[PDB]
Target: Designed miniprotein oPPalpha: Iva10Asn11 turn
Amino acid sequence: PPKKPKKPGXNATPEKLAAYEKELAAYEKELAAY
Model:
């Protein structure tokens, strides 16, 4: 099963927070595909 991306703290930078959102989106895509 696809692994959950490391959760960032509230003090995350907009770019990395957006990046995390994309990684989480990827998680959902791969989870659905699984």
